Amino acid sequence: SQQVDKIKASYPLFLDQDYKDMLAKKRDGFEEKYPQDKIDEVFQWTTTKEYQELNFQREALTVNPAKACQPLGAVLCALGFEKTMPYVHGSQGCVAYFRSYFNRHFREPVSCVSDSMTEDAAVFGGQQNMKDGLQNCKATYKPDMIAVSTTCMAEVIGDDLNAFINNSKKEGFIPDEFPVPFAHTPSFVGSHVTGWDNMFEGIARYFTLKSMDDKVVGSNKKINIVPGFETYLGNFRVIKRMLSEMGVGYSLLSDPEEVLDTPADGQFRMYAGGTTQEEMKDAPNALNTVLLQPWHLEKTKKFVEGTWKHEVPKLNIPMGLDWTDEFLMKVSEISGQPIPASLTKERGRLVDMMTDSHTWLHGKRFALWGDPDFVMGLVKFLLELGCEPVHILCHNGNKRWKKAVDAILAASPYGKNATVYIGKDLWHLRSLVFTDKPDFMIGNSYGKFIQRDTLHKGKEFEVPLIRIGFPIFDRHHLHRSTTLGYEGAMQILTTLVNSILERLDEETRGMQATDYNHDLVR
Amino acid sequence: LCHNGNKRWKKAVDAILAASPYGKNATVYIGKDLWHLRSLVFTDKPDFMIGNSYGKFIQRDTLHKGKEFEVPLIRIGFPIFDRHHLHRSTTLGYEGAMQILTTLVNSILERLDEETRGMQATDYNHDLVR
Amino acid sequence: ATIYFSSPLMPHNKKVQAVAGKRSTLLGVAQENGVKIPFECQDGNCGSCLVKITHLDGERIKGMLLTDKERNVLKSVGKLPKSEEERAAVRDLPPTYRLACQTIVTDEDLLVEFTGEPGGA
Amino acid sequence: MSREEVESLIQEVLEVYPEKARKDRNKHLAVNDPAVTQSKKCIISNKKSQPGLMTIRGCAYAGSKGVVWGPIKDMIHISHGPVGCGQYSRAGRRNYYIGTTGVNAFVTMNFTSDFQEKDIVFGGDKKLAKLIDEVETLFPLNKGISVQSECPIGLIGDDIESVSKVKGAELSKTIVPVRCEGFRGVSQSLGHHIANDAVRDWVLGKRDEDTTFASTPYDVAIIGDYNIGGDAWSSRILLEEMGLRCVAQWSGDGSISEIELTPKVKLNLVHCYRSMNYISRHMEEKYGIPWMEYNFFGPTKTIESLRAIAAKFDESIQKKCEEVIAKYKPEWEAVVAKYRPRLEGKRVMLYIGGLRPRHVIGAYEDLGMEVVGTGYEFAHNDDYDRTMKEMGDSTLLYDDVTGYEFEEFVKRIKPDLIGSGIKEKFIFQKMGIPFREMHSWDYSGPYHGFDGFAIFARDMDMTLNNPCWKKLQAPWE
Numbered sequence A: 001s002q003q004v005d006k007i008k009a010s011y012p013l014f015l016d017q018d019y020k021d022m023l024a025k026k027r028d029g030f031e032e033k034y035p036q037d038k039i040d041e042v043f044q045w046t047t048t049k050e051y052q053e054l055n056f057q058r059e060a061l062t063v064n065p066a067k068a069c070q071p072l073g074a075v076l077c078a079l080g081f082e083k084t085m086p087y088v089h090g091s092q093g094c095v096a097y098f099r100s101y102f103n104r105h106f107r108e109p110v111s112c113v114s115d116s117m118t119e120d121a122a123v124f125g126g127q128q129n130m131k132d133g134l135q136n137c138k139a140t141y142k143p144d145m146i147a148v149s150t151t152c153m154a155e156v157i158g159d160d161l162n163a164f165i166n167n168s169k170k171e172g173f174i175p176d177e178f179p180v181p182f183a184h185t186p187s188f189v190g191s192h193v194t195g196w197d198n199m200f201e202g203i204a205r206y207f208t209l210k211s212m213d214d215k216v217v218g219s220n221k222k223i224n225i226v227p228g229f230e231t232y233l234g235n236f237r238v239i240k241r242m243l244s245e246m247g248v249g250y251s252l253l254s255d256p257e258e259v260l261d262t263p264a265d266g267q268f269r270m271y272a273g274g275t276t277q278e279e280m281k282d283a284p285n286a287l288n289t290v291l292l293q294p295w296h297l298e299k300t301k302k303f304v305e306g307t308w309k310h311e312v313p314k315l316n317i318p319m320g321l322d323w324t325d326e327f328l329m330k331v332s333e334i335s336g337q338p339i340p341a342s343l344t345k346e347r348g349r350l351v352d353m354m355t356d357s358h359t360w361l362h363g364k365r366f367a368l369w370g371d372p373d374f375v376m377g378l379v380k381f382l383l384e385l386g387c388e389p390v391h392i393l394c395h396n397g398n399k400r401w402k403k404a405v406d407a408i409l410a411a412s413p414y415g416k417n418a419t420v421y422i423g424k425d426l427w428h429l430r431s432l433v434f435t436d437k438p439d440f441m442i443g444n445s446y447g448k449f450i451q452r453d454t455l456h457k458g459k460e461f462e463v464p465l466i467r468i469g470f471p472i473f474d475r476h477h478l479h480r481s482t483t484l485g486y487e488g489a490m491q492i493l494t495t496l497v498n499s500i501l502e503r504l505d506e507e508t509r510g511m512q513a514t515d516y517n518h519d520l521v522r
Numbered sequence B: 001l002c003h004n005g006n007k008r009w010k011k012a013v014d015a016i017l018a019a020s021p022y023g024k025n026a027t028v029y030i031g032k033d034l035w036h037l038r039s040l041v042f043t044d045k046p047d048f049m050i051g052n053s054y055g056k057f058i059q060r061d062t063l064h065k066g067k068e069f070e071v072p073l074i075r076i077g078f079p080i081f082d083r084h085h086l087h088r089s090t091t092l093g094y095e096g097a098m099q100i101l102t103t104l105v106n107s108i109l110e111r112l113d114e115e116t117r118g119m120q121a122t123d124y125n126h127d128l129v130r
Numbered sequence C: 001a002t003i004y005f006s007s008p009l010m011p012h013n014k015k016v017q018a019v020a021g022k023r024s025t026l027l028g029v030a031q032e033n034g035v036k037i038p039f040e041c042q043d044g045n046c047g048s049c050l051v052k053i054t055h056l057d058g059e060r061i062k063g064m065l066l067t068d069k070e071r072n073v074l075k076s077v078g079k080l081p082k083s084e085e086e087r088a089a090v091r092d093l094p095p096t097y098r099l100a101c102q103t104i105v106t107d108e109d110l111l112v113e114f115t116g117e118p119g120g121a
Numbered sequence D: 001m002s003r004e005e006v007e008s009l010i011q012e013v014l015e016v017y018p019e020k021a022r023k024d025r026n027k028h029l030a031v032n033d034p035a036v037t038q039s040k041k042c043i044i045s046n047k048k049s050q051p052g053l054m055t056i057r058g059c060a061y062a063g064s065k066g067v068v069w070g071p072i073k074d075m076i077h078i079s080h081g082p083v084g085c086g087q088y089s090r091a092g093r094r095n096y097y098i099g100t101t102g103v104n105a106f107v108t109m110n111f112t113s114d115f116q117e118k119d120i121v122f123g124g125d126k127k128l129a130k131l132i133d134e135v136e137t138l139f140p141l142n143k144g145i146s147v148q149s150e151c152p153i154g155l156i157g158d159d160i161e162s163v164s165k166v167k168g169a170e171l172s173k174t175i176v177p178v179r180c181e182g183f184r185g186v187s188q189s190l191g192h193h194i195a196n197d198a199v200r201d202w203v204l205g206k207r208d209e210d211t212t213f214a215s216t217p218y219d220v221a222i223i224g225d226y227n228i229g230g231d232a233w234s235s236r237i238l239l240e241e242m243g244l245r246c247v248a249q250w251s252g253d254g255s256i257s258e259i260e261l262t263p264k265v266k267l268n269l270v271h272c273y274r275s276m277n278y279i280s281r282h283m284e285e286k287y288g289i290p291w292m293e294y295n296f297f298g299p300t301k302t303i304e305s306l307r308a309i310a311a312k313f314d315e316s317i318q319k320k321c322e323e324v325i326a327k328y329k330p331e332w333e334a335v336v337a338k339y340r341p342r343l344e345g346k347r348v349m350l351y352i353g354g355l356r357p358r359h360v361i362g363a364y365e366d367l368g369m370e371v372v373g374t375g376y377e378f379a380h381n382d383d384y385d386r387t388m389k390e391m392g393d394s395t396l397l398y399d400d401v402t403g404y405e406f407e408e409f410v411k412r413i414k415p416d417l418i419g420s421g422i423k424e425k426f427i428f429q430k431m432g433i434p435f436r437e438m439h440s441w442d443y444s445g446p447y448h449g450f451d452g453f454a455i456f457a458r459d460m461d462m463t464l465n466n467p468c469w470k471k472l473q474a475p476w477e
């Protein structure tokens, strides 16, 4: 029953006595449920250490992974160019899932098309599909560019994009001068960041391979910035602001900043902003190219070094204090522009906040996961705060990244109790946080379940989660936050310290039991 | 509630409340202190409180009555003592409205997540996407 | 999947075991077992691989997709009544006559009959 | 009204397409005429999507793993293949359930083989067997395993049926191989068909030789209800208050035991015809169980369906149905009296997957709204047969509508509300038009029964009558 004045949604409507009795009768009669004591015993068994060692002996099964397939990153990279349509050569379910994922994360429209290959393509290939799709997309949505990726189906079939696009151009489906860069992005190699790398390299090679004769390094006096797989608009904003406040002329390549943040003014803009084609054509003219996330832009680095003849700096991701300082110093060295006073004042403010919050941030144990560059930047920033990252997890990390992270940890006294895992999923992390309890977790929304599991053991075993990473579905407008640079460091610091204070306030609230530590001033 | 408000301010707020259909159940208090607000939130329970750090006690009081009666607090104002670097926030203009909206929606979502974290009891509403 | 190939050209019907859902079609299964179904194209438009497929286990009939190329070839051959087209379009049920080069083996027992002539008498 | 205007709008919209695309898409747009009994002469459905037109359809894996097999809680579903497919469908659908996740329930967890290059080149059958062993050791309380295959599984030629049989014989477990590769079929409908075939072939015929279960003449089984936000529970309380006994639930909050016990049911109550008509027809042909379609959207459809269901039993069930209707009448009368004046006369446009565009029409009309345009992504011609009568004259019908087509239709018609999925919500909210998610209930619900009708009316009033829609234009613009 419902009261018209107070209408209840599923929670707590399904907590009513009649619904409870219905569910109890259903479980008793038809579900054949295991006894509750047996379920509790199995849960306790899953908590223990022997379950952990049985867990880590897994080599064929993956439970709750943390990574996506390459065409997702390929679509994200394609979205960052002006009037560019992402076009995935394969099945339509891939595109539907990509659009749903990015829609749930950014809460903004995402445009992507596919040729919808079916059993006919499975038997006889999908060149006709590519021709018809290119013609239909150009006729209907009128893009200045079509950026083509592939699914696992097109990779297993062996459908080669070069011949298909050349035939579609030669047979008159699209004009011969229409720019159609492509990339092979198999979903069984690497992760979404590898797809972003492949797509960016494909576009760059499409525009800067046949015109190397008249390019001289440094003619336009600009610096190329490659952001990589970035899901925080604040990072694009902070990079643009930091380079603009210093007098460095830059050319940001593949920026989805404007298209993923469009105003609601009664009209829908299918395209907005993006890197302009003449910026891609003039890219080799720049003084140098700096990769913001070098650990997933390896192929792009190779192409830039070997064809553009740029000496790409060996820089880390501009996260934290030291790495942002190194980034600014390298940019100053390349461009010849000195550091302005505003950046120094911002750094001083960040150090002031660090010294203010060090008392609460000291000695806290974090288990974190995410992408390689983001994870290593977060680990460095945590070590800079006096925190102890006890469990470090990266599903799509290699052994060289593990070596680099271990070298970073060994250079600080706060990384003694730190272990790095590569190739492990979130079930491994659940086992780790159950057997070696940290103070907090740092990751995407998929950790919200792990916390739930910990709460089943007891309030004294619950490990709160902090939502930094991709994707965040259970919170609104967190994609506008900043992670890179000084202001990103301040935002992360504020989030961490306020989460610590919120946890302490929640624990010390019971009257006459723990509220003696419910201090007004913290 | 506004301890240092006057009669003209009360009239202005009543006028702004009458202009919108959502101000039907609104009452403006001037000269009242936080004990009056404690009584008001105990007898007419709202969903959330908005104010400075001094409200943290009121929430505690509500939690002593029961979890279902707890009124969580959102720290927007002066002074904030139990939180770090919140004085750097913005309140005026479009950016301030953006921050306030984000804070309110995220507080609501955290409360909902807390209310539905019980395994096999209320976790059926522990949605991944909200 | 158990497939029984039958033909007046074959002295005896053959029983073969096939992996269901393979990218290689019934034509791959026919070729690897030496069943001489006349294949005369590589784009699936000739229709010479026309066969009659009977699902021996009526309960274990698997829904499939009848592609437009197969439908058009079968109409050009004449082995496609309007009732079977409606059944395939609404209930996603395979027709009696199929093309071996475009037929994906399903997990059931099948009887495949061919006369050795190209589709269309 | 304005049927000629509707046809001219369709003709103008179809102008941008090339000749092939225009000719194909002309068959999929229609003007509704309620007197038509056969949709084949008016609209065409269940065809492939035109390449590069931004269709909203999914794949067979979405319709099989994500829709039918996923809600089953005590089984473990392995996304056989690369990692993305399981990741994007993880907990994206609100099929509610009761249980302790990770111990005896596994609805919101992602099991995958995580295929790599060597898996593609050499195969994953040995990897599949090893994975099954690891699942058995790590999750002892699971009551069954289903292996949902993705595109590379069928593309490289893996034999998962033989592996399933061998492992099920070895471990005495129910292992169900589902060949739901994405390229098979043009949409999720073939995924529904394949999932139903797998259920029939590997699960349903298990308790055939036993009779331990005590049957009752009032035994019904809910078919095609997936508990989206708790809809199945509201329907269940409505049915149990009538005196019937619900034995099975397909598949929201469903268990393997309920599926196996379904053949011992007197009557099948099919909510979603599109997804579970196959298994209902199989049950009627094999076990002789009659099945009937009902509607629990809004008070009018709920009352009509309740009376129709009661008509199939003795007079005690009819008297209990009348008692239930009398009990629940004042609640929905009060809901209507509260919310109808705010929503009366508004025009709504719909575009959902299957059987929801026609089912929710009665709920909208119970609050005075009228549907001016509806359509489906993957409904067949029988669904259009069913939905022609329920829609007013000279209204718009679309099948597999594209982004451009839907945008232009919405721009010309200018409806007061649009109910569709997540991939159009942010497109139509930036145009200043209220939007409702009709797949996930906008993270609200349930909408079934009177308890759901209250929430439905509240949600429509909340979204439609919101101040934010009055401020889309700046005052100085």
Ligand code: ICS
Residues within 6 Å of the ligand: D063, D067, D093, D188, D226, D228, D272, D274, D275, D352, D353, D354, D355, D356, D357, D438, D439, D440
């Ligand atoms: S199963 Fe189908 S798309 Fe019938 S795949 Fe889809 S929970 Fe829709 S219109 Mo999501 S044929 Fe169910 C559906 Fe309808 S997932 Fe739900 S809302 S009533």
Ligand code: CLF
Residues within 6 Å of the ligand: A069, A070, A071, A091, A092, A093, A094, A095, A097, A150, A151, A152, A153, A187, D059, D060, D061, D062, D082, D083, D084, D085, D086, D149, D150, D151, D180, D181, D182, D183
């Ligand atoms: S139609 Fe369906 S959802 Fe698509 S792939 Fe095919 S089974 Fe799967 Fe998953 S992994 Fe990524 S998204 Fe695809 S490209 Fe390879």
Ligand code: SF4
Residues within 6 Å of the ligand: C118, C120, C121
């Ligand atoms: S039936 Fe006649 S036309 Fe056809 S293949 Fe045989 S000989 Fe040629």
Ligand code: FES
Residues within 6 Å of the ligand: C038, C039, C040, C041, C042, C043, C044, C045, C046, C047, C048, C049, C073, C099, C100, C101, C102
């Ligand atoms: S081989 Fe010619 S149609 Fe099959």
Ligand SMILES: [Fe+3]
Residues within 6 Å of the ligand: A106, A107, A108, D426
């Ligand atoms: Fe938005």
